[PDB]
Design a protein around this ligand. Structure first.
Ligand SMILES: C=C1CCN2C(=O)COc3cccc(c3)[C@@H](CCc3ccc(OC)c(OC)c3)OC(=O)[C@@H]3CCCCN3C(=O)C(=O)C(C)(C)COC(=O)[C@H](C)NC(=O)[C@H]2C1
Length: 109
């Protein structure tokens, strides 16, 4: 029940929530719980896309972004259980890391 915490930064439209099969178009910035940024689609000036229902992203995103409506900006705090677990992500994220993502849901495709 606490694998991902979603805290609203600015609201969306309150009606359009992503469904399985839909593609979410987002800008994000990921950091360790300490605060050290490890990636951001904003640094590439190009939104990230992922389709729900396909195991395309860590579980904290799959459940976390589905709680967001189009336009919403939110802070997602994801336990290692819902992220990279005991293994981490090769050369990026250590074992048992708590992650924090600033996510803006731009549109659905
Ligand atoms: C210019 C580019 C560099 C090369 N390039 C990629 O190499 C694509 O890399 C990914 C794409 C989609 C999802 C993934 C990783 C997955 C990782 C693989 C995966 C998939 C599913 C899992 O379960 C079912 C899982 O369970 C363990 C693991 O990333 C995630 O889910 C979460 C949530 C979505 C945002 C990224 N995410 C992170 O953590 C991070 O910020 C990373 C990966 C450290 C850094 O991301 C990036 O640079 C972004 C994405 N790269 C790109 O935009 C393209 C273009």
């Amino acid at each position: 029940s606490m694998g991902v915490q979603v805290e609203t930064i600015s609201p969306g439209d309150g009606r359009t929530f992503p469904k399985r099969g839909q593609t979410c178009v987002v800008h994000y910035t990921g950091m360790l719980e300490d605060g050290k940024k490890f990636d951001s689609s904003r640094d590439r000036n190009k939104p990230f896309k992922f389709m729900l229902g396909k195991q395309e992203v860590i579980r904290g995103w799959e459940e976390g972004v589905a709680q967001m409506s189009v336009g919403q900006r939110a802070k997602l705090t994801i336990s290692p259980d819902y992220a990279y677990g005991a293994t981490g992500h090769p050369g990026i994220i250590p074992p048992h890391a708590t992650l924090v993502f600033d996510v803006e849901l731009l549109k659905l495709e």
